[PDB]
Amino acid sequence: AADLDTQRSDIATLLKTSLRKGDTWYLVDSRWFKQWKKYVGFDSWDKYQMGDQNVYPGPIDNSGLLSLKEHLIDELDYILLPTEGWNKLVSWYTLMEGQEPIARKVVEQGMFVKHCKVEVYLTELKLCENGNMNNVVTRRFSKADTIDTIEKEIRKIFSIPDEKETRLWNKYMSNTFEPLNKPDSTIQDAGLYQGQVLVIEQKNEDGTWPR
Numbered sequence: 001a002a003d004l005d006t007q008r009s010d011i012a013t014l015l016k017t018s019l020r021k022g023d024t025w026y027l028v029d030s031r032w033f034k035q036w037k038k039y040v041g042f043d044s045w046d047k048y049q050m051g052d053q054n055v056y057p058g059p060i061d062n063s064g065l066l067s068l069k070e071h072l073i074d075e076l077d078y079i080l081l082p083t084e085g086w087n088k089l090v091s092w093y094t095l096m097e098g099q100e101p102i103a104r105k106v107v108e109q110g111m112f113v114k115h116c117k118v119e120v121y122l123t124e125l126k127l128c129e130n131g132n133m134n135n136v137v138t139r140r141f142s143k144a145d146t147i148d149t150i151e152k153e154i155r156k157i158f159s160i161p162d163e164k165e166t167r168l169w170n171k172y173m174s175n176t177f178e179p180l181n182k183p184d185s186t187i188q189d190a191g192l193y194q195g196q197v198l199v200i201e202q203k204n205e206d207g208t209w210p211r
Contacts, residue, residue, distance in 0.1 A: 001092045004051055008040045014085035019106050019116035026086035027078045027102040027120065029062045036089075059096040060089055068121065080118055107144045111188050119143060123187060124194050127154050130201040130210055147190055148183040154200050165203040170196060177211065
């Protein structure tokens with residue numbers, strides 16, 4: 001373990017690391033992190049518990065975040081560190097026995113107009129075939145995925161011969177069918193969000209479309 005001032009300084013810096021598309025960052029439970037902050041005198045006016053065993057964080061413990069509970073909020077329920085920051089905390093404190101790191105990637109976020117952000121939650125789309133809407137299959141996709149990518153995957157999920165031709169629709173406002181006819185739009189470009197229903201359609205043998 002590096003000394004307390006080194007830990008404070010290194011983590012302070014690493015917290016402010018620039019977001020670059022493709023990088024891996026790690027979640028750290030705010031409960032553990034708040035104890036670490038006290039132990040190392042981070043943002044602390046009287047340093048009263050700095051170096052005090054009563055606030056020694058112990059092995060990194062993300063149990064309280066768990067597959068993630070919903071409505072977790074950055075800088076309230078968890079904090080994020082780049083690879084180097086996570087590695088340092090592991091070497092100083094170890095990771096709690098029987099846990100795995102919670103790693104997430106930086107992706108471009110927004111509709112058309114975008115900037116980087118760690119994708120803590122992938123977008124869950126509800127998927128179904130036009131013939132059989134009650135058979136809904138759920139899957140999580142990144143905001144980076146294009147409509148083209150989504151469609152290829154939905155074909156696999158439903159075992160759709162590479163011969164049969166398909167069209168993708170989304171249910172706008174849970175109501176009207178709207179075409180997903182721009183294959184190179186990303187899912188957020190197309191305005192798709194958590195829980196959105198997507199319906200895949202197959203061209204008939206006779207060359208006509210079911211819809």
